[PDB]
Amino acid sequence: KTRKESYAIYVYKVLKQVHPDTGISSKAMSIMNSFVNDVFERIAGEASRLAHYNKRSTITSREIQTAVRLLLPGELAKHAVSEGTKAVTKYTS
Amino acid sequence: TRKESYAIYVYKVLKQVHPDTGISSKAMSIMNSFVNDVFERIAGEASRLAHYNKRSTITSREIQTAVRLLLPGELAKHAVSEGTKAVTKYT
Amino acid sequence: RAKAKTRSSRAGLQFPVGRVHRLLRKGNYAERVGAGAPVYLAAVLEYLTAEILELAGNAARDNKKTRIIPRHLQLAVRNDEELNKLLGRVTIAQGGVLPNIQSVLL
Amino acid sequence: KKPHRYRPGTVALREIRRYQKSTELLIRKLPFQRLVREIAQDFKTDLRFQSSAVMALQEASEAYLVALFEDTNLAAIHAKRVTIMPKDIQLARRIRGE
Amino acid sequence: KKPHRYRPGTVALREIRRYQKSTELLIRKLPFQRLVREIAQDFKTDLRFQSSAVMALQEASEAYLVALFEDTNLAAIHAKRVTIMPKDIQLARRIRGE
Amino acid sequence: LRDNIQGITKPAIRRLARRGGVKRISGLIYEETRGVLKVFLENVIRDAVTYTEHAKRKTVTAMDVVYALKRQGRTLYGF
Amino acid sequence: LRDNIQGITKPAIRRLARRGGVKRISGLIYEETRGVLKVFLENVIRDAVTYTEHAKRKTVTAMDVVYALKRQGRTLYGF
DNA sequence: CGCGTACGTGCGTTTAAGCGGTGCTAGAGCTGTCTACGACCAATTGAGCGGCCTCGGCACCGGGATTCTCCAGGG
DNA sequence: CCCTGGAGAATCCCGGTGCCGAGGCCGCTCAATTGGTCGTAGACAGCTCTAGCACCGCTTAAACGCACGTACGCGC
């Protein structure tokens, strides 16, 4: 039928990466899919605001970097920045 | 440069219903901030409204639904009647 | 053309970079979306996914459970101080609240 | 012959431990579903709600009421009191801005 | 002679009526300005603040503290008291989610 | 449909407060929270009514319930 | 810059309580209000710091303070 | 209802907030300039997902058990 | 009135079923991937000029501190 967009298998791939001896129910899968989409709307909404606040037309990696510092506080923020920085450098290399 | 502002627009509305009173710059900047803050709230809700029903356009119904979502009580139905009367006076 | 190598494997990631880039363009956020914007967004989403699931697995092994239950996801969020602050105004279905008792209650 | 005669509070603490570690929903579906239709009929008639729509509405209602109940509980012990009061709920709504 | 000797609390409502109808800033500008710099020094050493930037920070903090003091005050009458306590402030932040 | 506010029974409120760690529950608490639940339901459903009427739909979906709760800072996970 | 948390003096906190309708002000509330104000300032300014770095500016403007307060549901009118 | 101490009130006294003034550079707009970048167009392509086969973790049903709690007896 | 021994009932670990939701497999198809091509936002270089940083005089309302007592917090 019609395909619907979801992160059912990507959360599964992340779960098996660090915890290869556990499973997950579909109810918990939908919560994780809800959690990913809600954070996705918050960061992209902040990145959309950040470009409009500086009269900029495009959203770069610094817009995502600035957005996650506003939402994620303190200790949780610096790992997201470090993982974000190491992903960009690996992508460009 | 030129700065977009609603300072003149609030002034004409003020003397429309109360021509015996003035306004200050601090009150005007507060009212300019009030108009801008509601502007992003209604349009942000309307933009989110179009994305929910897979709509690529924003119509008067998008603004109408966002008003009743944001404005509570009889304030929504008063703005709905004012909004409807502007569309009829348009056509 | 060349081999259709996914952008997730190029950045050492599992989350779909192309899918994240697609919803950025069609989500009515900006006129253009940069090249590194979906890469940065996927890395942040992966870390939040991995951190929650790691603590959920720790909560799953606390009560000797293999399957992840939505109580475990709620327990992972509330126990972590950063996850509690980030998701303070977030309601999780089938999660309840923390099983804590006041000191004067006993 | 002598009955057990549990003193008040201990079973209340026991019910706290049994329900805080539980997962299932305390309020039954049918009484909550009929309340939704009665409220919605005052706004728009001939309105239907899906089974998952009532399910989503019921989970959020319990969590909101539980979070209000936790704030009501710590307000009581702040006032050197054990039993919650209706004025404690009115205090919680005003501070929360609701 | 004998001084007027206002009773404890009479001047409190007199200051309540004065500050609730006048919009002057209670906190002095320079002590609040230098506090902002030492807070921002932990995040960026070479940082500057505009005159209106410190102005915008002060009124937001003043209204937040007054609103917190409003939630702090009615918690005392809820606790059969008239004096605010630090446990009332922690009650307000926990209920508000801060 | 009348007198449907009595559907939330007295031990159902007691069970909810047991989840909240409440030690003892007053007899006037049950009547108070029924109005509180009615007020809370009168806002989310009304917001979901506008969501349903905007999509030209006659049945309120669980998607509209989530968006009604999301705009008030009470987002629900798992739908 | 050191010893700046004491800039919010004892009558300054008392004046804020009088605006909020507080009748009696305790002697232990001055340390508590300073900690709450420091915690609140450590979030708004830090959010404004990230807005300043993204704008390629080395000075914090009042416009970024409004944006920092807006995302936390504390939007300020009059800038 | 009673104990009390600690915060309301009053001013002595010090102390910095603020107005006005001076100088200067830290730096945000402003204007060119040149430069990679992403939407869009052909061309193609590869595993996410609907669904089916399989399978296994814990709900259910009891059985048994330690295990923290209440009632009664003794000092 | 407080300390300690025995037992009623809610609660926890465990043996056996199996079952219905979860894990892996079959394609393939629709969204993800590859290459070119420009309009165009953005990084970069030089000017500048209007607002902020630092110090000075004073002066004065704001603030630290001490004496006294009664509204109120806390104990019973």
Numbering used by the authors:
A (entry chain R): 28 to 120
B (entry chain V): 29 to 119
C (entry chain Q): 11 to 116
D (entry chain S), E (entry chain O): 36 to 133
F (entry chain T), G (entry chain P): 22 to 100
Can you list sentences taken from the study reporting this PDB entry?
To understand how these nucleosomal features impact Rpd3S binding to the NCP, we reconstituted an NCP with two extra 20 bp DNA linkers flanking the Widom 601 sequence (187 bp) and an MLA at the lysine-36 position of the H3 histone to mimic a tri-methylated lysine (H3K36MLA). 3D classification of the Rpd3S–NCP187bp/MLA complex results in one overall conformation containing three classes, in which the Rpd3S broadly engages the NCP at the SHL + 2 position with slightly different local positionings. Further local refinement of Rpd3S and NCP density allowed us to obtain high-resolution maps of Rpd3S–NCP187bp/MLA complex with the Rpd3S complex at 2.8–3.1 Å and NCP at 2.6–2.7 Å resolution. We named the 3D classes of Rpd3S–NCP187bp/MLA at the SHL + 2 positions collectively as the H3/H4 deacetylation states of the Rpd3S–NCP complex, and we termed the K9Q-locked class as the H3K9 deacetylation state. Within the H3/H4 deacetylation states, the active site of Rpd3 exhibits positional shifts of approximately 10–15 Å. The Rpd3 active site is ~33 Å away from the H4 N-terminal residue Leu22. A peptide of 9 residues could, in theory, cover this distance, which suggests that Rpd3S is able to target the H4 N-terminal tail from this location. Significantly, within one of the three H3/H4 deacetylation states, designated as class 3, the H4 N-terminal main chain exhibits a distinctive trajectory leading towards the active site of Rpd3, unlike the other two H3/H4 deacetylation states. Notably, weak density from a putatively unmodified histone tail can be observed near the Rpd3 active site in these H3/H4 deacetylation states. This supports the hypothesis that Rpd3S can sample histone tails at the SHL + 2 position for deacetylation in the absence of the H3K9Q substrate mimic.
